Ligand binder design. Structure first.
Ligand SMILES: Nc1ncnc2c1ncn2[C@@H]1O[C@H](COP(=O)(O)OP(=O)(O)OP(=O)(O)O)[C@@H](O)[C@H]1O
Ligand SMILES: [Ca+2]
Ligand SMILES: [Ca+2]
Ligand SMILES: [Ca+2]
Ligand SMILES: [Ca+2]
Ligand SMILES: [Ca+2]
Length: 901
DNA sequence: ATTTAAGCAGTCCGCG
DNA sequence: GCGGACTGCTTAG
């Protein structure tokens, strides 16, 4: 096999590299890497190296890496550009792996671990590590085994061995229900003292040194706790054995308001799963506890135990250890679904970076672009300092708030990346500038053509047309990958809808799910077999289809995020290719494109309807248009349609056969107007939306910018078995809105769009009557909690104190003295409830850590003093009044003349 | 650890 | 009450 790196580090004048050799074995080497950097040189000096602008360079080969870094410094003192890759490990990887990396994940040791620490005095601080580590579960991907290190004797209690037999048993048997599929994979090791446990753990670690290290909060808790605990017991040299090169650094992570410390383990790539989830999931969750996320992702029940975690080991060590093992498995189950580890490996190896660098789109693109240029013997420019400056973004149309009955939407495929490619936007393709006219002059095609030579953006920038820039070339490569995976995602989605339809008529038989590839549209033969399957088999196929869709989603959406991040990175001051001219060329062209095509679509539809000055485009955001289709439907007449699917078909055909060609013509004209390199504005139909045929549903409504709901029958070619709401911006979509309220508001919207005013009124009346029975957590608001200390004046709210911070201060006073009650963590999320006047907490609200039950000492009082009236008004009635007034609809029946009967 | 536009909740205080 | 200036938070692109 071709060789591939696992990890790379610079330590002084040495590169330390762990890798898989040509025979598939893991090896480690130290290499005295001599890096090269570059200086500009005279034109008369023969060279094969040129900077990105075609200026000649001489290569400087240094005796060692420190000499290279010192030369960069003196080049600054002199005032001259020091060109080349200044991150020497990336240069090392580029030299060592000068081919597309084919990696074999089965050879990469992925370790998933979790530790337990009993603490009788509150949260066990990793920097102090003053309590024994009493359990470690460590899953190894190569062995496919869970290694369980169990402390039997501690200052906080001596316990019996954990029993695998009880662990396997059902909860209803008094067992812990450790999943049967992992029972045979557990290797259990009890220890009668912590020193032996830790010494053995470290010997184990040397034998099975993780390459990828993950778990839940491992970077902020487990890793630093283990490091510091070992350090405190044995000394630093022993703790550094967690690094394969015996090198560690205390790294300070600094944000807006304060800082924290992590331990960098040289020669390990730490990918904390919480951080993977936050970057790659595109969710915003009310809580990031593993219990909460596991429930959300996998629909598994919360790990239940009696009493506080600080007494769980002494009271029920059996359950204590089982839940430690399950916790490790939950993360593996989440990854089986989401495939974020696979994603990181794919992207890391593609870019030729340390895998953990996938968290930095700047690092990722810096590496991609460096490798690309190096291939042509080109030399990257030196990074420079820039002051942070604001720059303009997208255009968003102000909608008239209203119901909108029939709607077809369209938006650009990969808008900003397509703009970069079309215009040829790149550091080295800048050709000059032209004299800019007001944007609206371009939108209306009245401005003088910017250039007859170069490719233009309406911000004034001109680009070469003779050759693609490195930014367009590299963005296209990742775009193509994105497109492939999106194809798989949408096939899986369409396949899912076939199964859902079949589920209406399940056969009464005993059979098996069909062995199929859900990434490809089901063949006719597969469809026939499906119509004969049982519900059991169909449900299993549906689950498999949806898992395949999730896999495709992960792969496509994060590739989308990477390419969009490149357009973004052009406006980040730390990016090597930072240029506000290029960042703004993209956004300004985008503004023009949207408003240009709005004009073209209005003109086209006014033509085919024989009207003048009518606005068919009702809304648009960045790269999208929403077109009112009422007149199209009305031209044939609702009576002519057999059912809902019939008019959906008709609108689908109209969009594909009339609208899209008109849109394409409009954009081809714009490309010529701007003299662009290549026509790449492809605005495909997104949604077909409307009420069910014959119903009183309103179809859709807008309240304002970035706030709307549509009843969608077909999305990007997926024809739903059941209509699906596309709701953007409204309170149903916000993590801050209570769970039960999101749910009730969604049902109000469903009823508005599908059933009409009367149905909405029936539901509102019921919700208003019953809501006080809802569980307090379900009706609690949610907020991030920053700057708690800033607004805390002797335990009371200072000036301008935010509502949620006031709640936290109330909580703090209410739990005062207790070291055992959960503390609110700065920067994390809280649940918030309003409190009735004259409550014993002495303020108008209370807040506590999200994803948790409020501590028992105050739970009863919070429940007694919860202000349901305020809660209902703020979270439910106020937003509903917004939805209904915009839709010109009443949520309560108005009096009429009929009342007199 | 890429980016801008823009929404709503709430505080403070004005608004004769 | 409602608006604007402002902070805080969160979502649509
Ligand atoms: N997370 C982001 N960071 C930077 N720019 C973004 C981000 N999301 C959207 N944009 C910008 O807005 C443009 C339009 O966004 P949109 O969500 O339609 O994605 P898109 O890139 O056009 O991909 P798709 O083909 O899925 O529509 C993007 O091309 C860019
Ligand atoms: Ca735990
Ligand atoms: Ca788009
Ligand atoms: Ca059937
Ligand atoms: Ca869009
Ligand atoms: Ca599309």
């Amino acid at each position: 096999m071709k060789e591939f790196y696992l990890t790379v580090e610079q330590i002084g004048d040495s590169i330390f590299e762990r890798y898989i050799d040509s025979n598939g074995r893991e090896r480690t080497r130290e290499v005295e890497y001599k890096p090269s950097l570059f200086a500009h040189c005279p034109e008369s000096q023969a060279t094969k190296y040129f900077d990105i602008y075609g200026k000649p360079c001489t290569r400087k080969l240094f005796a060692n890496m420190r000499d290279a870094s010192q030369w960069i410094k003196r080049m600054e003192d002199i005032g001259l550009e020091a060109l080349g890759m200044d991150d020497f490990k990336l240069a090392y990887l580029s030299d060592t792996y000068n081919y597309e990396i084919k990696y074999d994940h089965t050879k990469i040791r992925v370790a998933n671990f979790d530790i337990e620490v009993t603490s009788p005095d509150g949260f066990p601080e990793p920097s102090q590590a003053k309590h024994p580590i009493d359990a470690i579960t460590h899953y190894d991907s190569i062995d496919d085994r869970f290694y369980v290190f169990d402390l039997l004797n501690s200052p906080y209690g001596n316990v019996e061995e954990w029993s695998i037999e009880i662990a396997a048993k059902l909860q209803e048997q008094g067992g812990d229900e450790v999943p049967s599929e992992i029972i045979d994979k557990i290797i259990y090791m009890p220890f009668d003292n912590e020193k032996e446990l830790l010494m053995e753990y470290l010997n184990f670690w040397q034998q099975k040194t993780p390459v990828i290290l993950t778990g839940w909060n491992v970077e902020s808790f487990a890793i630093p706790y283990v490091y510091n605990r070992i350090k405190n017991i044995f000394g630093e040299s022993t703790a550094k054995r967690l690094s394969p090169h015996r090198k560690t650094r205390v790294k300070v992570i600094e944000n807006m308001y304060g800082s924290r410390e992590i331990i960098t383990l040289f020669g390990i790539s730490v990918l904390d799963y919480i951080d993977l989830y936050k970057k790659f999931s595109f969710t915003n969750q009310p809580s990031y506890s593993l219990d909460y996320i596991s429930e959300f992702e996998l629909n598994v029940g919360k790990l239940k135990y009696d009493g506080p975690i600080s007494k769980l080991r002494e009271s029920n060590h059996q359950r204590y250890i089982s839940y430690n093992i399950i916790a490790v498995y939950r993360v593996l189950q989440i990854d089986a679904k989401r495939q974020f580890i696979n994603l990181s490996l794919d992207m890391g190896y593609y870019a030729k970076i340390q895998i953990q660098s996938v968290f930095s789109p700047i690092k990722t693109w810096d590496a991609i672009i460096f490798n690309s240029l190096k291939e042509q013997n080109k030399v990257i420019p030196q990074g420079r300092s820039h002051p942070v400056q604001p720059y303009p973004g997208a255009f968003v149309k102000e909608p008239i708030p209203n119901r909108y009955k029939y709607v077809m939407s369209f938006d650009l495929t990969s808008a900003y990346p397509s703009i970069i490619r079309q215009v040829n936007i790149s550091p080295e393709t800048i050709a000059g500038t032209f004299k800019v006219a007001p944007l609206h002059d371009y939108i209306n095609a009245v401005a003088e053509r910017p250039s007859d030579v170069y490719s233009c953006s309406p911000n004034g920038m001109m680009y070469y047309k003779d050759r693609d820039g490195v930014v367009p070339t590299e963005i296209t490569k990742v775009f193509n990958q994105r497109k492939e995976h999106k194809g798989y995602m949408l096939a899986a989605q369409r396949n899912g809808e076939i199964i859902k339809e079949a589920l209406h008529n399940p056969n009464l038989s005993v059979d098996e799910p069909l062995d199929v590839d859900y990434r490809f549209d089901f063949s006719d033969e597969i469809k026939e077999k499906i119509k004969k399957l049982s519900a059991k088999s169909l449900n299993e196929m549906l689950f498999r289809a949806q898992r395949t869709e999730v896999a495709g989603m992960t792969a496509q959406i994060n590739r989308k995020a990477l390419i969009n991040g490149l357009a973004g990175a052009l406006g980040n001051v730390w990016f090597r290719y930072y240029d506000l001219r290029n960042a703004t060329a993209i956004t300004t062209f985008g503004q023009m494109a949207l408003q240009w095509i709005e004009r073209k679509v209005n003109e086209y539809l006014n033509e085919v309807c024989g009207t003048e000055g009518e606005a068919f485009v009702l809304y648009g955001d960045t790269d999208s248009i929403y077109v009112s289709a009422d007149k199209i439907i009305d031209k044939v007449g609702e009576s002519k349609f057999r059912d809902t699917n019939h008019w959906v078909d008709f609108l689908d055909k109209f969009a594909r056969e009339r609208m899209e060609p008109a849109i394409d013509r409009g954009f081809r004209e714009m490309c010529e107007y701007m003299n662009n390199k290549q026509h790449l504005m492809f605005m495909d139909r997104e949604a077909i939306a409307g009420p069910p045929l014959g119903s009183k549903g309103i179809g859709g409504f807008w309240t304002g910018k970035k706030r709307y709901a549509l009843n969608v029958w077909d999305m990007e070619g997926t024809r739903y078995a059941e209509p699906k709401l596309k709701i953007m911006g409204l309170e149903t979509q916000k993590s801050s809105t209570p769970k039960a309220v999101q749910k009730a508001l969604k049902e109000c919207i469903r009823r508005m769009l599908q059933e009409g005013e009367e149905s909405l009124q029936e539901y509102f009346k019921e919700f208003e009557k019953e809501f006080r029975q809802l569980n307090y957590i379900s009706i609690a608001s949610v907020s991030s909690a920053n700057n708690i200390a800033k607004y805390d004046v002797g335990g009371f709210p200072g000036p301008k104190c935010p509502f949620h911070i006031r709640g936290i201060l109330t909580y703090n006073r209410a739990i005062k003295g207790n070291i055992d009650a959960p503390q609110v963590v700065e920067g994390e999320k809280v649940y918030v409830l309003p409190l009735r006047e004259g409550n014993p907490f002495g303020d108008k609200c209370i807040a506590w850590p999200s994803g948790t039950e409020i501590t028992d000492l105050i739970k009863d009082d919070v429940l007694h003093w919860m202000d349901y009236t305020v809660l209902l008004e703020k979270t439910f009635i106020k937003p509903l009044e917004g939805f209904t007034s915009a839709a010109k609809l009443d949520y309560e029946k108005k009096a009429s003349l009929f009342d007199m009967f």
